[PDB]
Write a structure and sequence with these properties.
Two copies of one chain form a homodimer.
Chain A: E1 3-8, H1 12-23, E2 28-31, H2 47-60, H3 63-66, H4 71-77, E3 83-85, E4 87-92, E5 104-108, E6 116-118, H5 121-135, E7 138-140, E8 145-151, E9 154-159, E10 164-172, H6 179-183, E11 198-205, E12 230-235, E13 238-244, E14 255-262, H7 275-283, H8 287-292, E15 297-298, E16 303-304, E17 316-317, E18 320-322, H9 324-327, H10 336-358, H11 367-390, H12 394-425, H13 429-432, H14 447-465, H15 470-483, E19 500-501, H16 505-516, H17 521-527, H18 531-538
Parallel strand pairs in A: 1-2, 1-10, 2-7, 4-12, 5-19, 10-18
Antiparallel strand pairs in A: 3-6, 4-5, 8-9, 9-10, 11-14, 11-15, 11-16, 12-13, 13-14, 17-18
Helix pairs in contact in A: 1-5, 1-10, 2-10, 2-12, 10-11, 11-12, 11-14, 12-14, 12-15, 14-15, 16-17, 16-18
Bound molecules: flavin-adenine dinucleotide (2 copies) and chloride ion (CL) (2 copies).
One flavin-adenine dinucleotide binds at residues 8-14, 31-34, 40-44, 144-145, 173-175, 177, 179, 199, 201, 308, 323, 325, 332, 335, 337-338, 341 of chain A.
Chain lengths: 539, 528
C-alpha cells in the first residue's frame, strides 16, 4: 500500500535517484510544486561530474545517466539545445579599464575525463524525468507540500489540495525552500559558511563571443576560444558567468546563460533598481563586457536573490535524507553543485536500497552520507571563499587557479581508474574503495594536496581578516608552487607564467612517463603508464 | 513612451506577429500569464500551414517563420525534439473488435506542399519567442492582465502587479481564456457552432507503433507506415490522436501526444472517473488501441475539458484585433488551428502596419479580417461536424475523406502560385489578391468545390437529423465522386475503392498532363 520512497523535487537529483530506485523494483512517488518543462540553473559540467555520472550509470545499471556524461551523448540522446565546454576561462576587469591580457587564465579540459557540456537544464531535467516515469516512478506535478509527519512505520506528506502520500522513507531533493529543512528546523541560522554572494541571472539572446570584443596581442590569445567554454569575468568581490548554448557549428539553441555573483557585504542591495537595471549598472563598469553584451536581450523574468549560501546541522535522520542541494549551497563558481549531487547519489543509493530491503532505518547506516554531505559543502566553501578573496589581486588568484585545476586532473583520474578497474574485473571493490579516504568531500583527497590547500586557505583567510597583504600572500604561495614536485609540470601547473593550461596527447604521454619514476606513491598509482597505454586510453 | 502594439499571448500566433512588426521597426510589448518553456497543444502541421508559413516569411521578410515550414528546417533550426508527418492515417474501430483493414484511410502529403512535422510546441513557441525578442519586442511573462481600457489615443493594459502598459493597438493572441473576449463581452453565448466535442489529452512515454499491433493482410498495408504520420483512431461520435515525436531514426524525443475527442451529447461527463480513468475506459473498448498503448505512461498532469467549441460576435474593433484561437475553436481534427492562425497573421499584418503608419484605425480597413475570421470558423465547423456524423458509417466517411484531401493539392498550389508570382514580379499585388476570393475561410475557394462541399454538408446534416439514411447519403456522394471531372483522377481521389492516396512523382506528372487540357479554367490555372 505505502510507497517505498517519496522524493520531493523532480530536478536532476530527484529523477536520477528515482530512476535508480524504480529500476531496482522499488515503489517511488516524485512530488514537485512545478511542472516540466521548466528552467533550472546549474548549467556547466566539470571532469568530476562526467566520470561520476559514468560511475553511477555502470554501478546501478541506468544507461540514461551515462548519456549526460559527454557533449556527444547529450546531443544524441537528450536534445540539440546544449552548448560545448572545452575550457574554463577567467578574465580580470577593473572599473573603466580595458582588461589586461596578462591577467587571464584558461584550463582546457583534458580528453581523458571526457567532453564537458553547457546543459540546457529544461531538456536534461525533462529527459531524466521521462526516464524515471518510464522505469515506473509515479509523479504528481504542480503539487505543493504543506506538511511532513514521521511515525514508527513511515512518513505522511500532505498537499495543499488536501491529499496525502504515505511512504517508508522521504528524500528531499528541493533547494533553499526544502519543506523538510523547514519542518525539522535543519537550517543553521546563522549559516557556518564563510562565502558571501548574492546573484542576478537570466538567459539572453544576441550575446557575442568575448574573443571578438577584446584587443589581445596575437601571442597572449588563448589556444582555444573563450566562447567555446565557461567564461568568468572577474572583478573586486564578484564575477559574471557567460555560458553559451550556441558555441558550436549548427547549434540550434541561440540562448546564452548570464549571471553576476556579488559579495553583498561590499555590494549592498539596490531595491530602487529593477534586477535588469542593477545587472546593466555592473556591465557598464567594464568596457570589454559592455561591448560583448551590447546587443544582448533577456528572454526570461530576471532572478535577483539575497545572500544565496545556506547549510544544515543534519542531512540524514530516521526515514529521511536531505539531498546535496537541499542540504547546502556555496556558489555557481567552479560548477561543484552537480558534482556534489552525483557524489551523494553514488553513496546514498545502495545504502538506501539495503535499508529498504532489510526494513532497518538506523541512522548509523547513513553515517558516511552525513560525513560526505558536510565535507563537500565545507571544502566547496573554502575553494569559493579563497577565490573571491583572490579576485582583488591576479598574482594571488594565479596560485588559487593552478592548485584548483591541477587537483581536477588528479582527482578525475582517481575516479576513472577505479571505474576502469571495476569494468575490467567486475569487482565493485575498486569503486567502494573511493569511500575509504581520510578527507570526505575533498575533490583530490591526498595528504600532499590537503596540505597545499590548507596553506592556500590559511593565507587567503589571513588576507580577508587583514593579517597579511594580497601581495605578501601571493609571494608565499608562488614560491610553494615553484618548490612543488607534484603539479603535473608537462601541463604547466607548476609554472606561474603559464596562464593557459593546454593539455595535448604529447603532454599527457609525458605526464605518464614523469609519473612512472615519481617518489610519491599516489602520483605513481594515479598517473604512471607506458606511452602505449596512454595512446590506448585516448582511442 | 507608448508601444505601437501590445500583444497578449506569447504562443506562436503572438510571437510570429510580434516578430513581423518588430522587424518592420514597430515598438512591441508581448504579455503572457505563463513563462517559456511551456506545453501547448496543436502539434500536427498540414500542407496549407506549410505554404502559408513560407508566404508570411517571404512576404514580411522574417526567415525564422519559414524554418517552421519543413520537418528538415525544424530539426536544423528549432530543436531535434520534433517528429515527422508523412501522412494522415485513419483507422475505424468498433467496441470489442479488431480493426477492419478495409475501413482505413491514408492521405500521404505530396512533396509539392512540403514536409509536414509533429511540433513539440514548447520548442517551436520558445524559438519564435526568442526570435521576437531578438527583433526588439519587449516581454513580460508571469504577467496576469486585470483590465484593458481603450480611449481616442490608444489602450492601457493593467497588471495584477499594479503596473500598466500603454500602446496604440492591442492584439489578443491568447486562447479560450482571452481577457479581451471576456472583458468586452465578445463571446457568442450560446455559440452558433454545430460541432460538439470535449477532450482528454496528455504526453506519454512508451507508446508503440500501431503498425506492429495490427494483423493487417500484406496487400492492405499502407504505402507508408501509420506511425510516420498522425494516426486518427475513429469510433462512434469520437476519435483519438497518436502524434509521436520519436517516429524517425535517432529521434531524441521519446514522447507521444495522445488525446480523445468525445461528442458530449453521446458521451456525458464522468466526474466519478479521473481524467486518466476516463481516457483508459475508452482505450479498453478497442483491442488494437489497447495493445498500442499497453506500456504507455503519462508524463504530464492530464487535461480534461468541457465542450471545447467557442465563437465570437466581433473579432476586430477600433485599435484591437481578436487573433484566430482567441476568437473561436472547433476541434483538433485535420489540424486547421495553425492554418487558421497563419491565414489571419497574413491578412492582419500589412493592414495593421498601414494603420500604424497612417495613424488611422478606422475598423473599415479591417473588415476583411473579420470576414476571414468568421469564415474560417464556419467552414471548419462544417468540415468537423460532417466528419463526426460520418464516423458511424465508413462508406460515408470515405466521401468526406476524399472531398477534404483533394482540396490539399488544389488549395495548396493556389497559395504557392501567388507566392511564386510575388517573388518574380516583386509585387505584393499577387498575395493581396488571395483576399479577393468569393468564400473567405474555405481552404479551396472555387465554385465547383464550394458546391461539392455544400452538398456533402446538406446530406451529413440530414443524416444527423435522421431525415436521410447514412446509407442513402453514402450512395449519392459515391455517385457524385465517380461522375466528377475535378477530383485529381491520377491520385485516385475520384475512386472510392482507393483508400490509400499515395502521390508519387510519376502521378504528379500525370496530374500536370490531365490539367493542361481541362475544360475548367481553374484546373488549367492551378495544376498545368
Ligand atoms: C544561481 C545558481 C547557479 C548555479 N550554477 C551551477 C553551475 O554552473 N554548475 C553546477 O554544477 N551547479 C550549479 N548550481 C547548483 C545547481 O543548482 C544544483 O547542484 C543542481 O541544480 C541540482 O538540482 P536538484 O535536482 O538537486 O534541484 P532543483 O533543480 O533545484 O529542484 C528544486 C525543485 O524543488 C521543488 N520544490 C521546492 N519547494 C517545494 C515544495 N514545498 N513542494 C514541492 N516541490 C517543491 C521545486 O518545484 C523545484 O522543482 C547553481 C545554483 C544556483 C542557485
Ligand atoms: C486539444 C487541442 C488540440 C489541437 N490540435 C491541433 C492540431 O493538431 N493542429 C493544429 O494546427 N491546431 C491544433 N489546435 C489548435 C491550436 O492549439 C491553435 O490554433 C494554436 O495553438 C494557436 O496558437 P496561439 O499562439 O494563438 O495560442 P496558444 O498556443 O494557446 O498560446 C496562447 C498563449 O497565451 C497565453 N495566455 C492565455 N491566456 C492568457 C491570459 N489570460 N493572459 C495572458 N496570457 C494568456 C498562454 O500562456 C500562451 O502562452 C488544437 C487545439 C486544442 C485545444
Ligand atoms: Cl555549484
Ligand atoms: Cl485544429
Amino acid at each position: 500500500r505505502p510507497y517505498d520512497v517519496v522524493i520531493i523535487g523532480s530536478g536532476l537529483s530527484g529523477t536520477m535517484l528515482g530512476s535508480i530506485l524504480a529500476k531496482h523494483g522499488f515503489r517511488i512517488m516524485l512530488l514537485d510544486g512545478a511542472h516540466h518543462p521548466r528552467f533550472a540553473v546549474g548549467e556547466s559540467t566539470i571532469g568530476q561530474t562526467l566520470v561520476v555520472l559514468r560511475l553511477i550509470s555502470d554501478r546501478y545499471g541506468v544507461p540514461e545517466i551515462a548519456n549526460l556524461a559527454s557533449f556527444q551523448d547529450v546531443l544524441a540522446n537528450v536534445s540539440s539545445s546544449h552548448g560545448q565546454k572545452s575550457n574554463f576561462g577567467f578574465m580580470f576587469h577593473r572599473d573603466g579599464e580595458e582588461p589586461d591580457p596578462n591577467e587571464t587564465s584558461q584550463f582546457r579540459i583534458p580528453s581523458i575525463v571526457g567532453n564537458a557540456a553547457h546543459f540546457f537544464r529544461q531538456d536534461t531535467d525533462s529527459y531524466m524525468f521521462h526516464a524515471a516515469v518510464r522505469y515506473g516512478c509515479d509523479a504528481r506535478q504542480y503539487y505543493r507540500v504543506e506538511n511532513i509527519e514521521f511515525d514508527d512505520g513511515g512518513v505522511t506528506v500532505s498537499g495543499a489540495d488536501g491529499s496525502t502520500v504515505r511512504a517508508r522513507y522521504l528524500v528531499d531533493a528541493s533547494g533553499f525552500r526544502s519543506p523538510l529543512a523547514r519542518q525539522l528546523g535543519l537550517r543553521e541560522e546563522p549559516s557556518r559558511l564563510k562565502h558571501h554572494a548574492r546573484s542576478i541571472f537570466t538567459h539572453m539572446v544576441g550575446v557575442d563571443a568575448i574573443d571578438d570584443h577584446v584587443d589581445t596581442p596575437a601571442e597572449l590569445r588563448p589556444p582555444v576560444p573563450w566562447n567555446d567554454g565557461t567564461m568568468h569575468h572577474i572583478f573586486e568581490r564578484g564575477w559574471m558567468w557567460i555560458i553559451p548554448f550556441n558555441n558550436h557549428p549548427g547549434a540550434t539553441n541561440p540562448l546564452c546563460s548570464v549571471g553576476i555573483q556579488l559579495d553583498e557585504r561590499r555590494y549592498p542591495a539596490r531595491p530602487d533598481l529593477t534586477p535588469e537595471e542593477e545587472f546593466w549598472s555592473h556591465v557598464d563598469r567594464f568596457p570589454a563586457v559592455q561591448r560583448q553584451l551590447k546587443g544582448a536581450r533577456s528572454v526570461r523574468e530576471w532572478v535577483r536573490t539575497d545572500r544565496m549560501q545556506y547549510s544544515s546541522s543534519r542531512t540524514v535522520g530516521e526515514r529521511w535524507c536531505l539531498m546535496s542541494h537541499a542540504a547546502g549551497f556555496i556558489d555557481p563558481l567552479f560548477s561543484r553543485g552537480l558534482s556534489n549531487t552525483c557524489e551523494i547519489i553514488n553513496a546514498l543509493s545502495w545504502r538506501l536500497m539495503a535499508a529498504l530491503r532489510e526494513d532497518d532505518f538506523a541512522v548509523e547506516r547513513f553515517a558516511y552520507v552525513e560525513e560526505l554531505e558536510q565535507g563537500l559543502l565545507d571544502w566547496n566553501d573554502k575553494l569559493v571563499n579563497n577565490s573571491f578573496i583572490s579576485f582583488s589581486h591576479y598574482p594571488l588568484w594565479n596560485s588559487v587557479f593552478r592548485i584548483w585545476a591541477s587537483a581536477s586532473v588528479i582527482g578525475g583520474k582517481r575516479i576513472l581508474n577505479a571505474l576502469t578497474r571495476t569494468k575490467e574485473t567486475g569487482d565493485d571493490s575498486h569503486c567502494q574503495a573511493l569511500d575509504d579516504n581520510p578527507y570526505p568531500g575533498l575533490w583530490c583527497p591526498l595528504d600532499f594536496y590537503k596540505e597545499a590547500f590548507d596553506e592556500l586557505t590559511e593565507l587567503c583567510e589571513a588576507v580577508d581578516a587583514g593579517h597579511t597583504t594580497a601581495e605578501e600572500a601571493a609571494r608565499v604561495l608562488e614560491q610553494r608552487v615553484r618548490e612543488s614536485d607534484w603539479m603535473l609540470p608537462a601541463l604547466g601547473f607548476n609554472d606561474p607564467d603559464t596562464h593557459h593550461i593546454n593539455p595535448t596527447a604529447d603532454k599527457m604521454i609525458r605526464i605518464a612517463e614523469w609519473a612512472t619514476g615519481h617518489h610519491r606513491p599516489e602520483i605513481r598509482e594515479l598517473l604512471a603508464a607506458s606511452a602505449e597505454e596512454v595512446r590506448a586510453a585516448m582511442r
